[PDB]
Amino acid sequence: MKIWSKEEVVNKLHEIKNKGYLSVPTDMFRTDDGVVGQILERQFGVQENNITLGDLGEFELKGMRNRKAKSNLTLFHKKPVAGQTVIQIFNRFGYVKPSSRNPEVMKKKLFTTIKGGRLNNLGLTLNAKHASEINLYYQDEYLSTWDLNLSKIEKLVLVFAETIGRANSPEEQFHFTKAYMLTEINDITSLINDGVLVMDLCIDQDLSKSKGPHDRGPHLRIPISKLDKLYRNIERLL
DNA sequence: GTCCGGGCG
DNA sequence: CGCCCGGAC
Numbered sequence: 001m002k003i004w005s006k007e008e009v010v011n012k013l014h015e016i017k018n019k020g021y022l023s024v025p026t027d028m029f030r031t032d033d034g035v036v037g038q039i040l041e042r043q044f045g046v047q048e049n050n051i052t053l054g055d056l057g058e059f060e061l062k063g064m065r066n067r068k069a070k071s072n073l074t075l076f077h078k079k080p081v082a083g084q085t086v087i088q089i090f091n092r093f094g095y096v097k098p099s100s101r102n103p104e105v106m107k108k109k110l111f112t113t114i115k116g117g118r119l120n121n122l123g124l125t126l127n128a129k130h131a132s133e134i135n136l137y138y139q140d141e142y143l144s145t146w147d148l149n150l151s152k153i154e155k156l157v158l159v160f161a162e163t164i165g166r167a168n169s170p171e172e173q174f175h176f177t178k179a180y181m182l183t184e185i186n187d188i189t190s191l192i193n194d195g196v197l198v199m200d201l202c203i204d205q206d207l208s209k210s211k212g213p214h215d216r217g218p219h220l221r222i223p224i225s226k227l228d229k230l231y232r233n234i235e236r237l238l
Numbered sequence: 239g240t241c242c243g244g245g246c247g
Numbered sequence: 248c249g250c251c252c253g254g255a256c
Contacts, residue, residue, distance in 0.1 A: 030254070032243075033245040033253065034243030035243080038254090048242075049256095050254090076242085085239090087239085100252080111249080168245085202250095204252080217240060240255100242254075242255065244254100247250095
């Protein structure tokens, strides 16, 4: 592994921006929301991976399309350490509904965002005692517990991309024009309980096939506009 | 299974 | 917010 210095990342970010609109290699394309991150990684010599640690060693690289109304930032994924498994949660709380990409394909899905401080429409809520104990409830019924390690996200290099082309098309292109370094992470307990940091469940299954469901891992997520509640130091790198 | 990379109206 | 995907090993 290469552990990057800040100077080397800043130099690399400038190089990337200066290239302008980058394409999706034919070998990489797979109708994938995450291609923005795949491209940003490849520009940094980071190959596709499922390693837990920050992919630049001292930093973790995150790429996002510069949408006017942005999706939340996915920080990392983590299964519960205790209680109901995610598939058990899917079995119970999942629902049968056509694929949103191909309406001729029926899925069972659980795509839900769970927050502390309130119940969502499925009745699900979080209560954090500490970062090491975040509890999932259905109403007053305990379900599962997460113990989250945030070492991968201690230092983020967040990079925003302007786009041309239709979203998730082969012809989509990305110009990385802005980047921030976020460091000095706060404790997440309050952030869970105040509804700032959220957990997404993202599980689905093609019910015409005899595959099991695809659990993409419970996502810890944060809106970009609340990153200042998670990190006390934000630096404009690009 | 358990992580990685990210979306929409 | 309710709701949503593509991968790796």
